[PDB]
Amino acid sequence: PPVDCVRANELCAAESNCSSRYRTLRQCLAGNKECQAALEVLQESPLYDCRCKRGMKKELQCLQIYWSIHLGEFYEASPYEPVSNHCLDAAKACNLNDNCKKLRSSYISICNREISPTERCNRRKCHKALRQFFDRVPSEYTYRMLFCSCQDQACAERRRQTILPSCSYEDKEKPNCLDLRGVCRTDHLCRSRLADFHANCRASYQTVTSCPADNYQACLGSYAGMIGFDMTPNYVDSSPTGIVVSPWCSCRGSGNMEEECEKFLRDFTENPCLRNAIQAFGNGT
Amino acid sequence: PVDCVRANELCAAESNCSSRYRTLRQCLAGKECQAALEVLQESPLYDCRCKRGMKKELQCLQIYWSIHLEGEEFYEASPYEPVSNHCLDAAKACNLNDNCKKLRSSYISICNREISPTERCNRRKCHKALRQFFDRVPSEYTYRMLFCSCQDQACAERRRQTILPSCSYEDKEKPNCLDLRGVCRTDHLCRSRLADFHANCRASYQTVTSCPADNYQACLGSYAGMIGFDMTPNYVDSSPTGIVVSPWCSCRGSGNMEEECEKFLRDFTENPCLRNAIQAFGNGT
Amino acid sequence: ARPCGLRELEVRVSELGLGYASDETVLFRYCAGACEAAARVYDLGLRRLRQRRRLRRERVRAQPCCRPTAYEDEVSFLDAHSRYHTVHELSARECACV
Amino acid sequence: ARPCGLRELEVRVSELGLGYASDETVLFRYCAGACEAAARVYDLGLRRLRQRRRLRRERVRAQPCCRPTAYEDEVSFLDAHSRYHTVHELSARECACV
Numbered sequence: 001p002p003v004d005c006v007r008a009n010e011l012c013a014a015e016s017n018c019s020s021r022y023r024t025l026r027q028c029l030a031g032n033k034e035c036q037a038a039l040e041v042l043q044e045s046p047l048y049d050c051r052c053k054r055g056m057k058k059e060l061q062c063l064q065i066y067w068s069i070h071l072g073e074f075y076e077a078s079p080y081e082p083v084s085n086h087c088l089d090a091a092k093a094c095n096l097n098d099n100c101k102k103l104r105s106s107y108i109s110i111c112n113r114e115i116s117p118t119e120r121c122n123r124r125k126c127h128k129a130l131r132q133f134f135d136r137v138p139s140e141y142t143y144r145m146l147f148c149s150c151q152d153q154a155c156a157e158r159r160r161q162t163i164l165p166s167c168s169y170e171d172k173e174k175p176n177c178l179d180l181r182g183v184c185r186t187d188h189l190c191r192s193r194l195a196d197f198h199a200n201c202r203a204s205y206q207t208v209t210s211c212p213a214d215n216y217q218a219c220l221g222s223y224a225g226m227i228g229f230d231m232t233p234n235y236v237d238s239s240p241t242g243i244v245v246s247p248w249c250s251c252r253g254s255g256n257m258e259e260e261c262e263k264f265l266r267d268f269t270e271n272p273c274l275r276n277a278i279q280a281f282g283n284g285t
Numbered sequence: 286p287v288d289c290v291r292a293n294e295l296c297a298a299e300s301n302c303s304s305r306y307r308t309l310r311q312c313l314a315g316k317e318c319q320a321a322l323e324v325l326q327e328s329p330l331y332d333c334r335c336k337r338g339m340k341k342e343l344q345c346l347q348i349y350w351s352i353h354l355e356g357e358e359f360y361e362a363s364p365y366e367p368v369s370n371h372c373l374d375a376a377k378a379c380n381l382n383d384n385c386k387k388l389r390s391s392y393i394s395i396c397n398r399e400i401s402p403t404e405r406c407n408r409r410k411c412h413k414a415l416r417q418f419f420d421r422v423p424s425e426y427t428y429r430m431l432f433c434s435c436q437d438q439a440c441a442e443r444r445r446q447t448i449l450p451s452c453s454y455e456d457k458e459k460p461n462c463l464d465l466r467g468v469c470r471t472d473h474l475c476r477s478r479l480a481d482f483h484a485n486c487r488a489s490y491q492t493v494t495s496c497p498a499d500n501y502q503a504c505l506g507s508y509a510g511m512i513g514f515d516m517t518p519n520y521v522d523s524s525p526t527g528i529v530v531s532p533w534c535s536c537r538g539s540g541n542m543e544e545e546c547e548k549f550l551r552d553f554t555e556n557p558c559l560r561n562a563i564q565a566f567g568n569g570t
Numbered sequence: 571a572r573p574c575g576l577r578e579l580e581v582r583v584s585e586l587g588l589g590y591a592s593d594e595t596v597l598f599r600y601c602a603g604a605c606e607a608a609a610r611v612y613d614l615g616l617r618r619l620r621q622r623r624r625l626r627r628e629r630v631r632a633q634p635c636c637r638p639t640a641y642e643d644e645v646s647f648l649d650a651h652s653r654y655h656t657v658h659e660l661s662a663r664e665c666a667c668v
Numbered sequence: 669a670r671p672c673g674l675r676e677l678e679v680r681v682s683e684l685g686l687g688y689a690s691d692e693t694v695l696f697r698y699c700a701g702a703c704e705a706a707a708r709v710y711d712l713g714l715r716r717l718r719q720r721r722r723l724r725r726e727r728v729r730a731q732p733c734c735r736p737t738a739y740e741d742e743v744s745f746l747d748a749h750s751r752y753h754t755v756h757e758l759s760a761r762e763c764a765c766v
Contacts, residue, residue: 085593091647092595096580101597101645108646109656157652164654369691376745377693381678386695386743393744394754442750449752572726579722587716588709600714602728611686611758612739616698618685624677628670630700635733637766641710660709668735668766 002083005050005065006058012047022047026068042069052079052192054225055135063188074260076185078196086148086282087158093141100141103133111164121167130168131228143220149282150240157238163227169234169248177249177261183230190229197222203273209280210272216285219277233268243278244269286366289348290341292333302328313351325352334366335477337510338420346473359545361470363484364477368503370440371567372447375429385426388418396449406452415453415513428505434567435525442523448512454519454533462534462546468515475514482507488558494565495557504562518553528563529554574603574636574667583647590655594647598661605634605667638662672701672734672765681745688753692745696759703732703765736760 003011012018021041028035042048047069052062066079094100107129111121134142146163150156163169175183184190200222203210211219223245226233231247246268254261268274287295296302301324308321325331331352335345349364379385392414396406419427431448435441448454460468469475486504488495496504508530511518516532531553536546553559578599583592616632619625641659648654676697681690714730717723739757746752 088593095595095645095647096597102643105644105646105656108654109644112646112654112656154650158648161648161652161654373691380693380743380745381695387741390742390744390754393752394742397752397754439748443746446746446750446752577724577726579717581713581717581722585716585720585722586713588712598713598717600710600723600728602723602726604727611755612698612736612760614686615684615696615758618683619677619679619696622683624679624683625700626675628675628700629702629734630698631733631735635729635735635766636727637729637733638710639766657709660713662710668733668737 003046005052005062008046008050009065012045018045049083063192067188075198076195078199079192080196085155087155090144090148100137103137107133111167126167127228134224147278147281152240153238156240160235160238163234165234169232175249176253177265180249193225193229194231197226201274203271209276216277216280219273289333289335289345292330293348296330335364336366346477350473360483361480363481365481372433372440372443375433379426385422388422392418396452411452412513419509432563432566437525438523441525445520445523448519450519454517460534461538462550463542465534478511478514479516482511486559488556494561501562501565572603573606575665577602592647592649596645601636601638601662601665603636605636634667636667639666640664670701671704673763675700688747690745690747694743699734699736699760699763701734703734732765734765737764738762
């Protein structure tokens with residue numbers, strides 16, 4: 001079994017030549033003759049082709065290692081890639097399960113707590129608790145809440161409120177999407193979750209579902225994996241069937257890169273893969 | 286002045302003394318010994334004494350008797366430093382005081398618990414709890430129970446029962462008083478308590494009370510201080526006024542000691558000092 | 571008769587009379603049942619003294635009670651006006667007869 | 669109204685109805701008084717569900733109880749037939765509202 005990045009780094013750090021070659025490559029990539037020689041040595045090490053896993057121990061460290069030696073732009077490869085009111089029903093199933101009820105209430109109470117009149121909540125703490133809910137409660141509970149189908153506005157508003165968007169999603173400023181992307185790519189976790197969403201929800205013109213390998217589950221997981229970061233996506237409104245999800249951003253102020261900004265945003269707003277995966281989940285496919 | 290436990294610490298620290306005391310301890314029991322004894326009998330260790338209810342009382346007494354060895358006196362010197370019915374009333378005062386109530390109940394419950402049809406109680410444990418009562422409850426409570434005055438048999442029977450004699454006093458065999466004395470003198474505590482009783486309760490023909498220095502309190506304390514040992518004394522019966530106390534022994538089988546045995550027993554049974562002290566306590570003046 | 575212990579009931583939070591206009595459900599746990607242990611000597615004494623009017627005319631409990639020894643940390647729900655609420659110690663977690 | 673706590677009473681052991689023929693006295697301590705704390709949401713919930721006949725018609729305590737949290741270890745006495753007795757946990761030692 002190939003080794004993950006945390007372990008590969010232990011092995012490299014224990015031998016002075018590898019460690020020095022690694023330090024050199026890291027320095028080269030944070031920007032010749034030595035750089036090329038450093039790359040060549042590391043290609044024979046287990047750092048080359050090392051990967052990470054969602055819910056692993058030291059996920060962040062793994063990702064820091066992965067990106068420190070990654071050679072690179074619109075779509076980055078994922079570090080995780082190996083080589084009747086239905087929303088009310090969903091909330092009931094969650095509250096009747098001890099683990100779901102606890103972790104649900106925990107993010108609700110953290111995200112709903114006002115810090116001051118100019119601070120709706122502790123956003124960082126809120127995001128962290130949302131990550132805990134999606135990582136530690138099975139998807140049979142969490143996806144049923146996030147992706148439930150709706151026929152009226154009260155159901156759709158309940159769905160829109162799942163992540164408590166007033167704290168976790170909305171902000172005083174709505175940045176430009178490419179600026180937000182920029183901010184997301186400076187954080188190791190967000191960057192990786194974005195790249196994993198790009199890999200699993202990228203629309204295909206070849207498959208019946210428009211999803212890669214017709215794999216709805218992997219797309220839904222990667223979508224949910226972005227909740228709790230800079231690029232947290234949500235239902236933009238409480239329309240029942242006219243579902244639009246997006247990060248908290250717009251293509252205003254794009255200038256020369258309006259085309260690229262819009263292309264970026266469309267992977268959320270106008271993506272037949274994501275659309276179809278969300279709809280199939282709610283319908284019982 | 287300095288007690289025997291402290292006197293021994295000061296000896297154990299000094300070169301010549303500690304050496305002589307290690308010699309004496311190895312001799313006991315066990316010319317070079319006679320020399321060690323003499324030096325220690327001329328050191329200040331020979332003047333050390335003990336106190337009732339002190340910390341490490343037994344150690345103190347072991348030290349004292351290791352150097353206070355001409356032999357087999359009738360009266361040994363004390364190692365201790367000199368200083369409706371009324372019985373129901375005394376039980377009430379004791380049960381309304383938290384500390385007395387606790388320590389009373391503690392001996393009663395231990396002394397009253399049958400072990401088997403052949404063992405009335407754990408006598409050792411009973412005795413120990415009786416000592417705790419007399420040592421850790423003030424005499425204002427304990428003496429009022431032990432020395433209360435009576436006018437009828439119900440009062441006298443309650444007084445007789447204070448120490449729960451069925452367990453602590455009575456036994457299948459009634460030994461000869463000199464044999465009992467012999468056994469008592471092999472135990473450091475009993476031996477010392479008996480010597481203290483002899484020093485404070487021995488009748489005098491020179492004083493108005495017949496007690497030494499007319500000191501009723503010192504006699505009563507020393508009397509009560511023998512409860513919980515081999516020589517435990519008690520009211521021999523439930524006569525209201527005709528008070529007679531004795532250890533559990535007789536002068537049968539004395540032979541040529543009938544004179545010595547009877548003299549020993551009279552210090553309890555026919556002692557105007559002890560008689561007067563017990564009667565004056567109960568009278569309240 | 572079932573002895574003192576934890577019971578479970580599915581309830582609509584709006585049924586509870588606590589001011590929450592919500593159609594959400596919670597698992598409400600509570601303590602119920604008979605305390606079946608032998609009568610304490612304390613209680614027998616206290617019942618006798620009470621009957622004899624030796625007490626100073628006061629509320630006295632001379633019998634054990636089935637009551638929670640611990641409570642649920644928190645439960646949350648969304649109401650009809652799209653407001654979230656968190657309630658602390660709504661349900662029992664453990665029971666005992668005291 | 670005095671709140672939940674320890675009360676004291678001198679009693680003759682023969683008044684207690686526990687079979688001890690003795691003129692000794694004991695300090696009998698017990699728990700009495702009102703539990704005055706604000707009502708729990710648990711109890712308010714439970715009271716409503718009980719009124720609404722939702723609790724399976726069982727015995728439920730929907731109010732705190734003033735009861736002992738600890739008992740006296742032992743107390744002893746001698747009876748009229750010259751026999752000693754020791755009683756365990758006859759008095760309360762500490763009280764709480766639960």
